[PDB]
Amino acid sequence: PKPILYYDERSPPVRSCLMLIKLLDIDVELRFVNLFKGEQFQKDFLALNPQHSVPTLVHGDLVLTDSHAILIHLAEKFDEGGSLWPQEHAERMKVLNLLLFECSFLFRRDSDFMSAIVRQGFANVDVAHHERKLTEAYIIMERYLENSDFMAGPQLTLADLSIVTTLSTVNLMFPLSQFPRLRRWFTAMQQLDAYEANCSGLEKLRQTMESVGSFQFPSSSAVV
Amino acid sequence: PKPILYYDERSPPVRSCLMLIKLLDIDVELRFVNLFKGEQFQKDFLALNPQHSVPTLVHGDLVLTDSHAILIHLAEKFDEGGSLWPQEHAERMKVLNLLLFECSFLFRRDSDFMSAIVRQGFANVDVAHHERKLTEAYIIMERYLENSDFMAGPQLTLADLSIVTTLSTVNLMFPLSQFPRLRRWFTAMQQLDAYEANCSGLEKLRQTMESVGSFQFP
Ligand SMILES: Cc1ccc(C(C)(C)C)cc1S(=O)(=O)Nc1ccccc1C(=O)O
Ligand SMILES: Cc1ccc(C(C)(C)C)cc1S(=O)(=O)Nc1ccccc1C(=O)O
Ligand SMILES: Cc1ccc(C(C)(C)C)cc1S(=O)(=O)Nc1ccccc1C(=O)O
Ligand SMILES: [Cl-]
């Protein structure tokens, strides 16, 4: 039975899974869950995933409710032996470490910022506070890229797929002018055929956020 | 060379690593980084871990900056063939899925609440708001425990070690009396010899929070 992905492409973690699915040419059934309308609280979806979150993957009996587990599972089943989720223990641990950075730091802070916009309206958000917190994430990623060409080493890994979607979302608001390594890396990610899977949901998120938050992202910020 | 763990045992994720180290008899060099004094910001540690977070593990050339990577790494290096980090793919994915629940949901929400105390003062925290957020996490774990004795299945895994330390920290404020499966699970975890590794840091966190929060837990 082929994998089933419950998804809303506005979510950066969803887009990371879509990028991997395109990159590896995985045949997956897509089932849309509209987060803006609250469909993640439908009784049947809640029973499947009590965290009421996307992405959620159903693959046979296996139910995964975190993008980072979905990325690892799909890499192991469809990029077996490959370099996205590298074979050598230390290289694999490096990728895992950066996946968890994305979960615990970059996504956490972007989520905090974007949900404050939705709850309060942009005009009432402490933007300087969130600018400091997300600039710190930029600094950390710049450090990682000062030591290696991609996030977790010399070649593309799951860490880049996980991080680039949330980075592109942060960068709707906050420019990368002061971060040359992160700009070079982001530009390189944008040249990948798989990055096409990030573009549509990023734009839909931009539209939804501007509407719900009553504001406009500065057009000059996003690297394009 | 033996692993080096940079730690402050007030941190629940740190305590999860301490529990695994005791559980597996890992010879580790502990290096205390006093988070209350901001030692995670001095130049050499920042250069080591720009996230300025504990636990941080240095094992040869490998530098891990997240408790869940540290748990997996130590289980793979020191408990190959064990049930804590099971080899079968579906079981391993299930443990991984719960480790990420701890990171993304349970710890995130407990960190939100505790941060609010430190930043705003306990007297100014919207306790009802955080009670709702953390009770939702209790509800989810109760569902996870519906038909299995542990978080990720019939046996103790890394997921239980990760979750129990944060759970004990949430439980400083919010009791478990309404969640029968979760309360029984927690009592069972407290019977593990390895759980002794959680006790000191939990008490030190309580004391530090009550001092800085200018308050006193229930
Ligand atoms: C991850 C995510 C999914 C869906 C959305 C929209 C439906 C708003 C387009 C936004 C985001 S987001 O990355 O911008 N973060 C939030 C923003 C607002 C509210 C909640 C969150 C959250 O993460 O829970
Ligand atoms: C990460 C951290 C930093 C500083 C502290 C001291 C209170 C000891 C200064 C504790 C922690 S902690 O690791 O002990 N957990 C939290 C406790 C309070 C607020 C936030 C957190 C959190 O992690 O977010
Ligand atoms: C199914 C399996 C069997 C044997 C192994 C090893 C011999 C490599 C331990 C690994 C796996 S696994 O494909 O499920 N592995 C990981 C999953 C999540 C995070 C890290 C790993 C990892 O391998 O380090
Ligand atoms: Cl593989």
From Swiss-Prot, chain A:
Top-level taxon? Eukaryota
List all membrane-crossing ranges: none
| Family affiliation | Belongs to the GST superfamily. Epsilon family.
E.C. code:
2.5.1.18
Gene3D superfamilies documented for this protein? 1.20.1050.10, Glutaredoxin (3.40.30.10)
What keywords does the record list, in alphabetical order?
Answer: Detoxification, Lipid biosynthesis, Lipid metabolism, Steroid biosynthesis, Transferase
Under catalytic activity, the entry for this protein gives:
RX + glutathione = an S-substituted glutathione + a halide anion + H(+)
The protein depicted here goes by the name: Glutathione S-transferase E14
Question: Which tissues does it occur in?
Answer: Expressed in the adult ovary (at protein level).
Record's keyword annotation contains Isomerase: no
Read off the InterPro entries from this record: Glutathione-S-Trfase_C-like, Glutathione-S-Trfase_C_sf, Glutathione_S-Trfase_N, GST_C, Thioredoxin-like_sf
Say what happens when this gene is deleted.
Embryonic lethal. Embryos display severe developmental defects such as poorly differentiated cuticle, failure of head involution, abnormal gut looping, and defective mouth hooks and dorsal closure. Trichromes are absent. Embryos have a higher sterol content. Embryonic lethality, defective epidermal differentiation and trichome development can be rescued by supplementing embryos with 20-hydroxyecdysone (20E), ecdysone or cholesterol. RNAi-mediated knockdown results in larval lethality at the second instar stage, which can be rescued by supplementing larvae with 20E, ecdysone or cholesterol.
Q: Which GO terms describe its cellular component?
A: cytoplasm
Q: Which gene encodes it?
A: GstE14
Q: What else is known?
A: Member of the Halloween gene group.
> What are this entry's molecular-function GO terms?
glutathione transferase activity; steroid Delta-isomerase activity
- What range does the record give for the signal peptide? none
Give any single GO term for biological process.
Answer: glutathione metabolic process
Residue span(s) of domain GST C-terminal: 88-215
Question: What role does this protein play?
Answer: Conjugation of reduced glutathione to a wide number of exogenous and endogenous hydrophobic electrophiles. Essential for ecdysteroid biosynthesis. May be involved in detoxification.
Q: Which residues form the GST N-terminal domain?
A: 1-82
Curated annotation (Swiss-Prot), chain B:
Phenotype upon gene inactivation: Embryonic lethal. Embryos display severe developmental defects such as poorly differentiated cuticle, failure of head involution, abnormal gut looping, and defective mouth hooks and dorsal closure. Trichromes are absent. Embryos have a higher sterol content. Embryonic lethality, defective epidermal differentiation and trichome development can be rescued by supplementing embryos with 20-hydroxyecdysone (20E), ecdysone or cholesterol. RNAi-mediated knockdown results in larval lethality at the second instar stage, which can be rescued by supplementing larvae with 20E, ecdysone or cholesterol.
State the Gene Ontology BP annotations: cholesterol homeostasis; ecdysteroid biosynthetic process; glutathione metabolic process; response to toxic substance
State if Manganese is listed as a keyword. no
Enzyme class per UniProt:
transferase
Catalysed reaction, written as an equation: RX + glutathione = an S-substituted glutathione + a halide anion + H(+)
Q: Which InterPro entries match?
A: Glutathione-S-Trfase_C-like, Glutathione-S-Trfase_C_sf, Glutathione_S-Trfase_N, GST_C, Thioredoxin-like_sf
Where in the numbering of this chain does the GST C-terminal domain appear? 88-215
- Which UniProt keywords are listed? Detoxification, Lipid biosynthesis, Lipid metabolism, Steroid biosynthesis, Transferase
> What else does UniProt say about it?
Member of the Halloween gene group.
Q: What is this protein called?
A: Glutathione S-transferase E14
